[PDB]
């Protein structure tokens, strides 16, 4: 079973988005008004699930093939790849990376999405994988489209892929969104702008990666992820 043998660098909650960011309207009623209560790290927080023994399907990481109803999906073929490291630069191997997204026209395969852009019969928009022994992951997909949403009267999400990363503990687990280099919607989005620091926003922008493209086939984007720094315990209970 799991053991308490490490500590995680405390989060900077001014680098992350704050809870109450009223231009993102849903945050108004879904943000605590009381202060978070700080607690010391124990085995409860410094451990978490490892997914090495989860059984993955052959196409779990390949959105071009994992919703195959007779053809390929329509849209911009891309590899999305990167490395997961911690704040000390140490790779995070064998960690669970999950992703989900809309299709090329900004439509999600969910009942609650009634956007008039059509569903793609050969696209589901869901992927998962484990990072390899050196911390790298990769997915193949189509570039999602932007889409409108009921925030302000003319608000549009930039194209994005939702990500979740487990990391070594429940203290490291993160959900975020990947945006794409140059997208003119990024500066305009109240969800992006829930992050107050422009340098932090830049950390969510995937870069075009021609070096990793398959010529005559698909482009590639690079999205590196940084989880909380992990260190050994030192001088505790003495």
């Amino acid at each position: 079973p799991a053991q308490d043998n490490s500590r995680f660098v405390i989060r900077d909650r001014n680098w992350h988005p704050k809870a109450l960011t009223p231009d993102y309207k849903t945050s108004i009623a879904r943000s605590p008004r009381q202060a978070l209560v700080s607690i010391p790290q124990s085995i409860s927080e410094t451990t978490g699930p490892n997914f090495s023994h989860l059984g993955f399907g052959a196409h779990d990481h390949d959105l071009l093939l994992n919703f195959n109803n007779g053809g390929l999906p329509i849209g911009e073929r891309i590899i999305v790849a990167g490395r997961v490291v911690d704040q000390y630069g140490k790779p995070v191997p064998n960690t669970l990376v999950e992703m989900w997204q809309a299709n090329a026209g900004g439509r999600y395969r969910h009942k609650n999405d009634r956007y008039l852009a059509p569903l793609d019969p050969n696209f589901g928009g869901v992927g998962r994988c484990l990072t390899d022994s050196d911390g790298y992951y990769s997915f193949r997909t189509i570039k999602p489209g932007p889409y409108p949403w009921r925030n302000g009267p003319n608000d549009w999400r930039p194209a994005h892929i939702h990500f979740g990363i487990s990391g070594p503990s429940i203290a490291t687990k993160l959900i975020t969104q990947l945006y794409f280099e140059g997208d003119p919607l990024i500066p305009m989005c109240p969800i992006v702008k829930s992050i107050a620091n422009p340098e932090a926003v830049q950390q969510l922008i995937a870069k075009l990666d021609m070096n990793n493209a398959n010529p005559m086939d698909c482009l590639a984007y690079r999205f590196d992820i940084v989880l909380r720094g992990q260190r050994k315990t030192h001088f505790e209970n003495c």
Partner: protein, 200 residues
């Protein structure tokens, strides 16, 4: 000062989180193996219990699109981190609230006592992380049990909450669902009865 690489910033999970992390709850086809809400096989050691709850916003309205992750010790106070659908017990699971099912459920065992880093016993608890549209960074809380009053009163984590009235928000209420032992743990994100949320 020493400045490390910054952590990748959080963003909301958004309203379609279930398509990625709760496929059955989304009403979409599932893969052969999914991480879900049945932590214990019927023959896992310990007292088998149902956990359930509803999530409320600051206006007192149901959150019908939440996603929850849980982490708890097994009945013997051991965290089982080698996730596997064949395990008798997994310490990790996932659940959700949806338009059709506004109340989340978890099938588990009552966790055993684990000590904090100073060797002081913590009362039996489930660690919970809450994600949803409108929540920019996930909210951490703990579910404790109303039939562990003696242990709860001595828990070094509960005792970091300055006000007794606020400690009460983390205590799940024993009840019976279909005749079987259950505990209800409602979460109020904002306002009256606001649930304690942690940073660590």
């Amino acid at each position: 000062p020493i400045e490390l690489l910054p952590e990748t910033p959080s963003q909301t999970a958004g309203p379609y989180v279930h398509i990625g992390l709760a496929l059955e709850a989304a009403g979409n086809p599932t893969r052969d193996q999914e991480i879900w809400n049945r932590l214990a096989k019927p023959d896992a050691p310990g007292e088998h219990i149902l956990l359930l709850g509803q999530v409320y916003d600051g206006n007192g309205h149901l959150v019908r699109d939440s996603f929850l992750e849980v982490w708890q010790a097994d009945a013997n106070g051991e965290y089982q981190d080698a996730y596997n659908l064949e395990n008798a017990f997994n310490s990790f699971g996932r659940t959700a609230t949806t338009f059709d099912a506004g109340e989340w459920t978890l099938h588990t065992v009552k966790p055993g006592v684990v000590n904090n880093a100073a060797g002081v016993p913590m009362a039996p608890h489930i660690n919970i992380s809450l994600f949803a549209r409108g929540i920019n960074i996930h909210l951490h809380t703990r579910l404790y049990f109303d039939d562990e009053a003696q242990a709860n009163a001595k828990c070094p984590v509960l005792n970091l909450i300055e006000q007794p009235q606020r400690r009460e928000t983390l205590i799940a209420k024993r009840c019976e669902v279909d005749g079987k032992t259950a505990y209800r743990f409602d979460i109020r994100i904002q306002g009256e009865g606001e649930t304690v949320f942690f940073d660590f």
